[PDB]
Amino acid sequence: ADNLPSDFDVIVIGTGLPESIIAAACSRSGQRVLHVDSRSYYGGNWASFSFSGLLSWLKEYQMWQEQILENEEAIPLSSKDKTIQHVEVFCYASQDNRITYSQIIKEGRRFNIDLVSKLLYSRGLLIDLLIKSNVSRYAEFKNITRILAFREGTVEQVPCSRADVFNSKQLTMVEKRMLMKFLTFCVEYEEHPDEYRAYEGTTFSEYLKTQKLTPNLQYFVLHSIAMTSETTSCTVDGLKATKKFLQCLGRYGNTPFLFPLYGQGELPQCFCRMCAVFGGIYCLRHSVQCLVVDKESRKCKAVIDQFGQRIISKHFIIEDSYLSENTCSRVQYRQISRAVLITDGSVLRTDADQQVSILTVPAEEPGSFAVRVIELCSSTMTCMKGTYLVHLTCMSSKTAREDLERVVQKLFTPYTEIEAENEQVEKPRLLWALYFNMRDSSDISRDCYNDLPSNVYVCSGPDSGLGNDNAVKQAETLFQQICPNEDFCPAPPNPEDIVLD
Amino acid sequence: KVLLKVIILGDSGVGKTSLMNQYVNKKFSNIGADFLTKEVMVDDRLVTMQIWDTAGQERFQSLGVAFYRGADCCVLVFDVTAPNTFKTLDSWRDEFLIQASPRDPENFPFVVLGNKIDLENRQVATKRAQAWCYSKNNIPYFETSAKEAINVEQAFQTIARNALKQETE
Numbered sequence: 274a275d276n277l278p279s280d281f282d283v284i285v286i287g288t289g290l291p292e293s294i295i296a297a298a299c300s301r302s303g304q305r306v307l308h309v310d311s312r313s314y315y316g317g318n319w320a321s322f323s324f325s326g327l328l329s330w331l332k333e334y335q336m337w338q339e340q341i342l343e344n345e346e347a348i349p350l351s352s353k354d355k356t357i358q359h360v361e362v363f364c365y366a367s368q369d370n371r372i373t374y375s376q377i378i379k380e381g382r383r384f385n386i387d388l389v390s391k392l393l394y395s396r397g398l399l400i401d402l403l404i405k406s407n408v409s410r411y412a413e414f415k416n417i418t419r420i421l422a423f424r425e426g427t428v429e430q431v432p433c434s435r436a437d438v439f440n441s442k443q444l445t446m447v448e449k450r451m452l453m454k455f456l457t458f459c460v461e462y463e464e465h466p467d468e469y470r471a472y473e474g475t476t477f478s479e480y481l482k483t484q485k486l487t488p489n490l491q492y493f494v495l496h497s498i499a500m501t502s503e504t505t506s507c508t509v510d511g512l513k514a515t516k517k518f519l520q521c522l523g524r525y526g527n528t529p530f531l532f533p534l535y536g537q538g539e540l541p542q543c544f545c546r547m548c549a550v551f552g553g554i555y556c557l558r559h560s561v562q563c564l565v566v567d568k569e570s571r572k573c574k575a576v577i578d579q580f581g582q583r584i585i586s587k588h589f590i591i592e593d594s595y596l597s598e599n600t601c602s603r604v605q606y607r608q609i610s611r612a613v614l615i616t617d618g619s620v621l622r623t624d625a626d627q628q629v630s631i632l633t634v635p636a637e638e639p640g641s642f643a644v645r646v647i648e649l650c651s652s653t654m655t656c657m658k659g660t661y662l663v664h665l666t667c668m669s670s671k672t673a674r675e676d677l678e679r680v681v682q683k684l685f686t687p688y689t690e691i692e693a694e695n696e697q698v699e700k701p702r703l704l705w706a707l708y709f710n711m712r713d714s715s716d717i718s719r720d721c722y723n724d725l726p727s728n729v730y731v732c733s734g735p736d737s738g739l740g741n742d743n744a745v746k747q748a749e750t751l752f753q754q755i756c757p758n759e760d761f762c763p764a765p766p767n768p769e770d771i772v773l774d
Numbered sequence: 775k776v777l778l779k780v781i782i783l784g785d786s787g788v789g790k791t792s793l794m795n796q797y798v799n800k801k802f803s804n805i806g807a808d809f810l811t812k813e814v815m816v817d818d819r820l821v822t823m824q825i826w827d828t829a830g831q832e833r834f835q836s837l838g839v840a841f842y843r844g845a846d847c848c849v850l851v852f853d854v855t856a857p858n859t860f861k862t863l864d865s866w867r868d869e870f871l872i873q874a875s876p877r878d879p880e881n882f883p884f885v886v887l888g889n890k891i892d893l894e895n896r897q898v899a900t901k902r903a904q905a906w907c908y909s910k911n912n913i914p915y916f917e918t919s920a921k922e923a924i925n926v927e928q929a930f931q932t933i934a935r936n937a938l939k940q941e942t943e
């Protein structure tokens with residue numbers, strides 16, 4: 274044994290979140306799974322890195338014909354990843370309360386920089402899947418403690434939990450009445466189908482206009498509570514979002530969001546573990562050269578790895594980045610604008626340092642999209658003590674820097690050796706910044722890809738949204754095609770399910 | 775109330791999973807090992823130990839960083855009848871420090887288990903393994919047999935005491 278087996282039921286290429294969930298599901302159902310990756314770490318474009326690991330990651334973006342048997346043809350795979358672009362790095366801190374770049378390097382292992390900036394809702398596809406499958410035992414979570422809004426070009430905490438409201442007076446009593454009344458209504462908008470009657474055909478932002486709501490509250494709801502594309506979302510879509518938001522409140526904290534200790538990057542490994550636990554065989558630093566197609570049936574028969582080994586399988590799951598440019602000549606990708614910052618203070622300073630916040634900045638110019646800002650504190654185990662890790666994300670328009678620096682500039686001020694009259698009133702300092710674009714291959718039809726056999730499935734990378742619903746949904750959909758009528762990631766066996774005398 | 779995370783490292787086939795099952799379940803065999811929990815007394819203090827199995831991801835040296843996060847103690851196991859599993863002890867130790875980034879890594883609690891001593895065709899000498907264990911900042915060395923349950927209980931008593939040290943320091 275210990276020699277890699279030459280046949281499996283399922284072969285999965287890429288250890289991104291979607292891929293790992295589907296590998297877990299197949300393995301859990303009883304399929305012999307082989308899960309490979311070309312990188313030396315798990316995650317693919319869902320990974321997180323130590324500071325030193327990130328600099329190495331940055332770098333990059335700045336043997337089988339004799340195995341093809343009779344009656345077969347090959348579909349070469351990609352050998353070079355091209356999902357990242359426009360990498361821009363800036364180090365404002367000094368090179369060697371003042372955090373120098375040298376301190377960052379020394380404590381580099383205290384950082385866990387996610388390539389993907391998302392959050393978990395108290396209830397949703399991923400969290401519900403973590404609890405049901407028990408993959409949740411593999412992680413610890415932190416609660417988001419603050420919802421922030423950006424109006425008038427200024428930061429401010431938005432009261433959400435019906436309590437948080439009555440513990441503040443940032444709103445008149447005429448607006449508060451509109452609030453409870455409006456929220457209590459959204460919490461069950463489908464019970465009063467007379468409030469969004471004719472607005473069904475129109476968008477949500479449009480709908481909010483003609484409501485018993487000022488512009489202020491109309492703002493908070495539209496950008497901080499619903500958080501939906503105020504343009505690319507109709508009334509229903511908008512109300513449904515608010516309901517989701519509100520219902521998730523108070524389940525764990527004063528907001529509807531949780532963040533995994535050590536970062537989003539832990540999620541794919543959690544699922545990969547479940548796959549392993551149930552028999553999955555893992556191989557990192559293990560690329561596949563090509564797919565082997567049966568000229569007769571037209572089904573994919575096997576793969577040939579970088580070592581020249583033929584490995585047979587019934588189903589083949591491949592993450593988009595591994596397909597050749599030829600296989601992808603017609604695909605129209607979208608892009609994700611990302612920015613990672615290491616700061617020495619919170620966007621909104623307070624006594625209680627260890628806070629995890631999410632700020633929403635609406636698009637200012639046409640053609641651009643809402644920017645999501647997530648602030649992590651050291652106790653989230655993603656950055657060293659004394660700093661904050663801020664993640665900015667938005668669907669792309671132009672390059673990452675062009676799309677986001679504008680927002681970074683309004684919230685942070687580049688570190689300098691210029692002491693100001695009073696720092697406590699000064700904007701937080703930016704010590705180090707990274708900008709980059711990531712390919713968005715989500716919501717792309719299978720047929721957009723050329724000549725891929727029917728038993729070859731494709732996984733997309735991450736999307737630009739706040740949650741992981743796209744990662745779960747596609748996995749679930751895949752499982753339905755590979756294992757018809759089978760509980761998806763059922764809960765592992767338990768002696769307590771059926772209690773006897 | 776104190777929870778300790780202990781991981782057991784080493785090449786495939788040395789007995790890691792059996793050492794875990796023998797310690798917690800007092801049962802030996804010859805699929806599906808994940809992690810076991812055991813309540814133990816360390817010098818009168820009550821602690822909880824959480825043993826994490828590799829789920830076989832080391833078969834192709836594919837253990838990820840998640841697996842090492844916050845480990846309080848790292849058990850390094852080798853097969854006394856397979857000299858090559860002893861030579862990889864350094865590589866597994868280096869890997870642990872790389873992925874776990876523990877506080878004060880030069881004094882991190884490593885316990886080494888020379889397993890399968892019940893087998894007659896031993897290839898690695900007790901003295902040799904002790905010299906290496908000593909050279910590595912004097913880490914504890916126990917010779918065990920998961921099959922005959924020899925030295926496992928005592929080996930884990932030290933693993934537990936050392937785990938609690940790292941967890942408290």
Ligand SMILES: Nc1nc2c(ncn2[C@@H]2O[C@H](COP(=O)(O)OP(=O)(O)O)[C@@H](O)[C@H]2O)c(=O)[nH]1
Nearest residue numbers: 786787788789790791792803804890919920921
């Ligand atoms: N003779 C003997 N066999 C053992 C012992 N421990 C484990 N094994 C056997 O050696 C093989 C590998 O053991 P396993 O526990 O799966 O170790 P792992 O691969 O390191 O996690 C299995 O055939 C076990 O039954 C031991 O103390 N003595």
Ligand SMILES: [K+]
Nearest residue numbers: 835865866869
């Ligand atoms: K190695």
Ligand SMILES: [Mg+2]
Nearest residue numbers: 790791792830
């Ligand atoms: Mg094992």
